[PDB]
Enzyme design. Structure first.
Site, PDB file in Angstrom:
ATOM      1  N   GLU A 207       0.837  -1.208  -0.066  1.00 30.34           N
ATOM      2  CA  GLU A 207       0.025  -0.006   0.031  1.00 30.34           C
ATOM      3  C   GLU A 207       0.997   1.142   0.050  1.00 30.34           C
ATOM      4  O   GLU A 207       1.942   1.060   0.676  1.00 30.34           O
ATOM      5  CB  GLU A 207      -0.796  -0.110   1.219  1.00 30.34           C
ATOM      6  CG  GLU A 207      -1.778   1.009   1.380  1.00 30.34           C
ATOM      7  CD  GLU A 207      -2.481   1.184   2.694  1.00 30.34           C
ATOM      8  OE1 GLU A 207      -2.345   0.086   3.637  1.00 30.34           O
ATOM      9  OE2 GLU A 207      -3.032   1.905   3.108  1.00 30.34           O
ATOM     10  N   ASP A 209       0.422   5.248   0.631  1.00 29.54           N
ATOM     11  CA  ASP A 209      -0.600   6.048   1.203  1.00 29.54           C
ATOM     12  C   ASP A 209       0.234   7.284   0.842  1.00 29.54           C
ATOM     13  O   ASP A 209       0.919   8.032   1.437  1.00 29.54           O
ATOM     14  CB  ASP A 209      -0.585   5.885   2.716  1.00 29.54           C
ATOM     15  CG  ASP A 209      -1.311   4.725   3.326  1.00 29.54           C
ATOM     16  OD1 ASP A 209      -2.055   4.159   2.246  1.00 29.54           O
ATOM     17  OD2 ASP A 209      -0.965   4.172   4.352  1.00 29.54           O
ATOM     18  N   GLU A 212      -2.769  10.569   3.728  1.00 31.44           N
ATOM     19  CA  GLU A 212      -3.774  10.419   4.951  1.00 31.44           C
ATOM     20  C   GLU A 212      -3.913  11.753   5.545  1.00 31.44           C
ATOM     21  O   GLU A 212      -2.781  12.043   6.070  1.00 31.44           O
ATOM     22  CB  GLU A 212      -3.269   9.418   5.680  1.00 31.44           C
ATOM     23  CG  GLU A 212      -3.472   7.938   4.858  1.00 31.44           C
ATOM     24  CD  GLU A 212      -3.280   6.621   5.707  1.00 31.44           C
ATOM     25  OE1 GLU A 212      -2.063   6.489   5.866  1.00 31.44           O
ATOM     26  OE2 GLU A 212      -4.027   5.997   6.429  1.00 31.44           O
ATOM     27  N   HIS A 223       3.771   1.438   2.582  1.00 30.39           N
ATOM     28  CA  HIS A 223       3.784   0.049   3.559  1.00 30.39           C
ATOM     29  C   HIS A 223       4.161  -1.186   2.776  1.00 30.39           C
ATOM     30  O   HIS A 223       3.144  -1.630   1.983  1.00 30.39           O
ATOM     31  CB  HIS A 223       2.438   0.002   3.824  1.00 30.39           C
ATOM     32  CG  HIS A 223       1.789   1.090   4.857  1.00 30.39           C
ATOM     33  ND1 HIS A 223       1.771   0.885   6.183  1.00 30.39           N
ATOM     34  CD2 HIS A 223       1.166   2.344   4.662  1.00 30.39           C
ATOM     35  CE1 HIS A 223       1.024   1.920   6.844  1.00 30.39           C
ATOM     36  NE2 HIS A 223       0.876   2.563   5.889  1.00 30.39           N
TER      37      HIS A 223
HETATM   38  C1  LIG Z   1      -5.806   4.335   4.302  1.00 27.22           C
HETATM   39  C2  LIG Z   1      -5.218   3.176   5.298  1.00 27.22           C
HETATM   40  C3  LIG Z   1      -5.847   1.775   4.871  1.00 27.22           C
HETATM   41  N1  LIG Z   1      -3.801   3.109   5.484  1.00 27.22           N
HETATM   42  C4  LIG Z   1      -3.279   2.858   6.394  1.00 27.22           C
HETATM   43  C5  LIG Z   1      -3.795   3.108   7.817  1.00 27.22           C
HETATM   44  O1  LIG Z   1      -4.849   1.909   7.985  1.00 27.22           O
HETATM   45  C6  LIG Z   1      -3.002   3.082   8.875  1.00 27.22           C
HETATM   46  O2  LIG Z   1      -3.386   2.909  10.218  1.00 27.22           O
HETATM   47  C7  LIG Z   1      -2.672   2.787  11.348  1.00 27.22           C
HETATM   48  C8  LIG Z   1      -1.257   3.061  10.969  1.00 27.22           C
HETATM   49  C9  LIG Z   1      -0.372   2.520  12.252  1.00 27.22           C
HETATM   50  C10 LIG Z   1      -0.772   2.590  13.564  1.00 27.22           C
HETATM   51  C11 LIG Z   1      -2.261   2.306  13.820  1.00 27.22           C
HETATM   52  C12 LIG Z   1      -3.202   1.932  14.868  1.00 27.22           C
HETATM   53  C13 LIG Z   1      -4.524   1.762  15.020  1.00 27.22           C
HETATM   54  C14 LIG Z   1      -5.112   1.989  13.842  1.00 27.22           C
HETATM   55  C15 LIG Z   1      -4.699   2.211  12.718  1.00 27.22           C
HETATM   56  C16 LIG Z   1      -3.541   2.381  12.464  1.00 27.22           C
END
Ligand SMILES: CC(C)/N=C\[C@@H](O)COc1cccc2ccccc12
Ligand SMILES: *[C@@H]1O[C@H](CO)[C@@H](O)[C@H](O)[C@H]1NC(C)=O
Length: 431
Positions: A207, A209, A212, A223
Site C-alpha cells: 500500500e 499512502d 492520509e 507500506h
Molecule cells: C488508508 C489506510 C488503509 N492506510 C493505512 C492506515 O490503516 C494506517 O493505520 C494505522 C497505522 C499505524 C497504527 C495504527 C493503529 C491503530 C489504527 C490504525 C493504525
C-alpha cells in the site's frame, strides 16, 4: 459474490490527466466505483439480505463458498445513500449520510476495470480541500496492489469484479472485508460495531499512502508487504507488522518529524483552503526499471511552490523526503522496529508500484485508535515528549467515532485535479 441486477450501477465520472514531458497533459475519462463492503448484499434470486447490520444470514450463508454463490452485490445510489458526488473533475465524499458512515471508492479506467497506475519514475498530483475535514477524520488517497478486475480472473466465486468494487486489500491485512478470494468471509464472524464485523480471513497487499490527512495533520507513508499482489491471510500472517505486511509504514508527517508549524490552519500549507499535493517516485537510475530510491513531496498553494518540511529530530538527518536511510533513522529515533525494512523497504514498495496499483479515495473514522496515530499522541501510553509520540495537536480524547459521527456528520473532503505522469510534468513553474 454474484452481480446483482436490482439497482443499476452507474459509476460517477471523475476525469484525470496523464502527462508527459513533451506532450503535456491529456484527459482520461476515468470513473469511480464504491468499494464492495459498503454495498447491499442480497440473494441472487431476489431481495432478501445476505447481510444486515453486522451479521450474515446463516441460511443463505452457512459457509464462504455457499454465501458467494447465493449472494449478490448490487448497484449504489452514490449521492443519496453514500454522500458521494462528482462534478466530473472533483470528487466530494461526505462523512455521514443517514446511517451510512464514510466511503471508499476506486478510480476506474472503464466500467469493469480499475485504472492501473504504474508510478515508478513518475509523479502523482491532486488538489484537496480539507476545510471541512476536522480532527478525528481521515480523507485518504492511496494506492493498493489490487487486481484491475477486482479478483475476477483469479477467483471463480467472484462474478462481480471491479464493477462492484471487489478485491480490496491493504497493508493492514483487514479482516473486516466481507468478500475475499471470491468467498464470503463468514468464518468465526465477530461483530465489531453496528454495521461491521470481522471474519477469519484478512486480505493483504502493499500500500502506498499518498495522503492520509485532515485539516490538523497529514502523512504520506509507503507500506511494503513481502507478498506480491492481493493475498488472503489467516492466523499469524494477518498480524500487523509481524505478519506479511508492514502495518506501521515509513511515514512522513511534518509535525511528527518536528516541524509543528508547516501544515495546518493558517500555516505554510494552509489547510483552511484548497491546495495541490505533488508526490514523485524517484528511482536510483531515473528509469522505470530502477529501484525506488526516494519519495518526494511538493505542495502548491495560491501559485506558491512549497517544498516539503525538513525533519527536525535528534539522530535523524534533516531531510524532506522518504528514503531507506530516513526510514531507518526515524524508526531508531522513534523506538519503532523497522518492519518497513524487514518487508524489503523502498525496493519492495517500488516493485509493487512497478507492477501497477489501484487508486483508492476515502473518508473515514477510526474505531481502533480514534485517528490519534494521525493527529495526536500515539501510542496513548507513551510520553508525548518522546520523539515520535506526538503527530498533531488534536486532543487525545478526539476522534471517537460515536462522537464525530454525531458532532460533525456533514464533514467532507474534496479531491480534484487528479494528474499523473512524468516527473516534473504534472505541474509547471515560471518566473
Ligand atoms: C488508508 C489506510 C488503509 N492506510 C493505512 C492506515 O490503516 C494506517 O493505520 C494505522 C497505522 C499505524 C497504527 C495504527 C493503529 C491503530 C489504527 C490504525 C493504525
Ligand atoms: C536522476 O535525476 C536526478 C534529479 O532528480 C539527478 O539529480 C540525477 O543526476 C539523475 N541521475 C542520473 C543517473 O542521471
Amino acid at each position: 459474490q454474484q452481480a446483482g441486477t436490482n439497482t443499476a450501477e452507474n459509476h460517477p465520472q471523475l476525469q484525470s490527466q496523464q502527462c508527459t514531458t513533451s506532450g503535456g497533459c491529456k484527459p482520461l475519462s476515468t470513473k469511480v466505483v464504491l468499494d464492495s463492503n459498503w454495498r447491499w448484499v442480497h440473494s441472487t434470486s431476489g431481495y432478501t439480505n445476505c447481510y444486515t447490520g453486522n451479521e450474515w444470514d446463516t441460511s443463505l450463508c452457512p459457509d464462504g463458498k455457499t454465501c458467494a454463490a447465493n449472494c449478490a452485490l448490487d448497484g449504489a445510489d452514490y449521492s443519496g445513500t453514500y454522500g458521494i458526488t462528482s462534478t466530473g473533475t472533483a470528487l466530494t465524499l461526505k462523512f455521514v449520510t443517514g446511517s451510512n458512515v464514510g466511503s471508499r471508492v476506486y478510480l476506474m479506467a472503464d466500467d469493469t476495470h480499475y485504472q492501473l497506475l504504474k508510478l515508478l519514475n513518475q509523479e502523482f498530483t491532486f488538489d484537496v480541500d480539507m476545510s471541512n475535514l476536522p480532527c478525528g477524520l481521515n480523507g485518504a488517497l492511496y494506492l493498493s496492489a489490487m487486481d484491475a478486475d477486482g479478483g475476477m480472473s483469479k477467483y471463480p466465486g467472484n462474478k462481480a469484479g471491479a464493477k462492484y468494487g471487489t478485491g480490496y486489500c491493504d497493508s493492514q491485512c483487514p479482516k473486516d472485508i466481507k468478500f475475499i478470494n471470491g468467498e464470503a468471509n463468514v468464518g468465526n464472524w465477530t461483530e465489531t460495531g453496528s454495521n461491521t464485523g470481522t471474519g477469519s480471513y484478512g486480505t493483504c497487499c502493499s500500500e502506498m499512502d499518498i495522503w492520509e490527512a485532515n485539516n490538523d495533520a497529514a502523512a504520506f507513508t509507503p507500506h511494503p508487504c513481502t507478498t506480491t499482489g492481493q493475498t488472503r491471510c489467516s492466523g499469524d500472517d494477518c498480524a500487523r507488522n509481524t505478519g506479511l505486511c508492514d502495518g506501521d509504514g515509513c511515514d512522513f508527517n511534518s509535525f511528527r518529524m518536528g516541524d509543528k508549524t508547516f501544515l495546518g490552519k493558517g500555516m505554510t500549507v494552509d489547510t483552511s483552503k484548497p491546495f495541490t499535493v505533488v508526490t514523485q517516485f524517484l528511482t536510483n537510475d531515473n528509469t522505470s526499471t530502477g529501484t525506488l530510491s526516494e519519495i518526494r513531496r511538493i505542495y502548491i498553494q495560491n501559485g506558491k511552490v512549497i517544498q516539503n518540511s525538513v525533519a527536525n529530530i535528534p539522530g535523524v538527518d534533516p531531510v524532506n523526503s522518504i528514503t531507506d536511510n530516513f526510514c531507518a533513522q526515524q524508526k531508531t529515533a522513534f523506538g519503532d522496529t523497522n518492519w518497513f525494512a524487514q518487508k524489503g523497504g523502498l525496493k519492495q514498495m517500488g516493485e509493487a508500484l512497478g507492477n501497477g496499483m489501484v487508486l483508492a479515495l476515502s473518508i473515514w473514522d477510526d474505531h481502533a485508535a480514534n485517528m490519534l496515530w494521525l493527529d495526536s499522541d500515539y501510542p496513548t501510553d507513551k510520553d508525548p515528549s518522546a520523539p515520535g509520540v506526538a503527530r498533531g495537536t488534536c486532543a487525545t480524547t478526539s476522534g471517537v467515532p460515536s462522537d464525530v459521527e454525531s458532532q460533525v456528520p456533514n464533514s467532507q473532503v474534496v479531491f480534484s485535479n487528479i494528474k499523473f505522469g512524468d516527473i516534473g510534468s504534472t505541474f509547471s513553474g515560471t518566473s
